[PDB]
Design a protein around this nucleic acid. Structure first.
Length: 51
RNA sequence: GGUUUCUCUUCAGAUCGCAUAAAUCUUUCGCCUUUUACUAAAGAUUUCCGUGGAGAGGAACAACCCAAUUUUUUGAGGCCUUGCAAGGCU
């Protein structure tokens, strides 16, 4: 045997199944940095005048 | 009692081998009509060219000097009192 067609195999390959068909994605970062600047109103998301 | 040299069995931990091949399978890659033959990395399992320890049998070559301080060549023996022991003695 020679592994001649390894991307196109008779089944779904392991990497292909992970990336497209419901394998576990690594999912590393989640909302790493989402902080409003201190000078901004939380409701308006714009610089406050009367804090 | 020894050494050398062949065959077989068994166990291999040691860089088993200051050397280094191939095959099979699974992952990823490169080739791109299909299959041989392949490109190159990881992991797993075998084969092959060699090696070490132990045991058994065969054959060949050799042989049944301190006595003078610090130790071991003596300060060694004798008397008195009390309940051999202690002390005083010579």
């Amino acid at each position: 045997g020679k592994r001649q067609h390894q991307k196109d195999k008779m089944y779904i390959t392991c990497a292909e199944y992970t990336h497209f068909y419901g394998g576990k994605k690594p999912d590393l970062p989640q909302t790493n940095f989402r902080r409003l600047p201190f000078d901004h109103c939380s409701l308006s998301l714009q610089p406050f005048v009367y804090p």
